[PDB]
Design a protein around this ligand. Structure first.
Ligand SMILES: O=c1[nH]c(-c2ccc(C(F)(F)F)cc2)nc2c([N+](=O)[O-])cccc12
Ligand SMILES: [Zn+2]
Lengths: 46, 162
């Protein structure tokens, strides 16, 4: 696992071509996330 | 491990607000459904609260350290995470073994605002070979699992991604 850029705790991937896409995020320390909900699902055929 | 899973009732406001975030953040993907399958919505079968005192205290300790480095602002978000290692994460927490070595922003742990983005990683990088039963990345039968996670961003480095 790499380090976050100096002076930063995470990276934000800002959508920059796809106008509809939401952001993605990267942390470099496992302690900075807690898995609060487990969602069991199926994708639905349109 | 110390982890218990508590089932939420569909009548519980917490079940309903987590389901809405899952359903409302589906988008179309540039791969036309290659990785995660073709769909506009989910059939939610179950939502469980992940309860682990030790993992929670590990998270809140780190959150206080970040907050004190960032003018008392943790910059906490609720984000999706899809992984073949979801069962190891709920028991042992996130660590370097859950990192995406080849990710666009280097070796880290990736989260998404779009539930359908996290859905692309449930069966591995690029959807791997799809469900273990039918080898189908667009399987409509097999049960899938995602995590909805509490994530401390603190001071986040902004990468514009064209
Ligand atoms: O929810 C997400 N999960 C994963 C992922 C990647 C690799 C692994 C594995 F190598 F351990 F198998 C496990 C999970 N990657 C994401 C990305 N991304 O582009 O990395 C963007 C947005 C969300 C996610
Ligand atoms: Zn299947």
């Amino acid at each position: 696992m790499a380090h976050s850029p100096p002076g930063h705790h995470s990276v934000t991937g800002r959508p920059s071509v796809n106008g509809l896409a939401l952001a993605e995020y990267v942390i470099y320390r496992g302690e900075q996330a807690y898995p609060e909900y487990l969602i069991t699902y199926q994708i639905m055929r349109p | 491990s110390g982890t218990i899973l508590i089932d939420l009732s569909p009548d519980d406001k917490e079940f309903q607000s987590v389901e809405e975030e899952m359903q409302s953040t589906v988008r179309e993907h540039r791969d036309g459904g290659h990785a995660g399958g073709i769909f506009n919505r989910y059939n939610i079968l179950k939502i469980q609260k992940v309860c682990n005192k030790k993992l929670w205290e590990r998270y809140t300790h780190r959150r206080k350290e970040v907050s004190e480095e960032n003018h008392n602002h943790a910059n906490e978000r609720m984000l999706f995470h899809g992984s073949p290692f979801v069962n190891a994460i709920i028991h042992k927490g996130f660590d370097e073994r859950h990192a995406y070595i080849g990710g666009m922003f280097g070796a880290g742990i990736y989260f998404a605002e779009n539930s359908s983005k996290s859905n692309q990683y449930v069966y591995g990088i690029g959807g791997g070979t799809g469900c273990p039963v039918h080898k189908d990345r667009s399987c409509y039968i097999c049960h899938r699992q995602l995590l909805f996670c509490r994530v401390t961003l603190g001071k986040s480095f902004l990468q514009f991604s064209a």
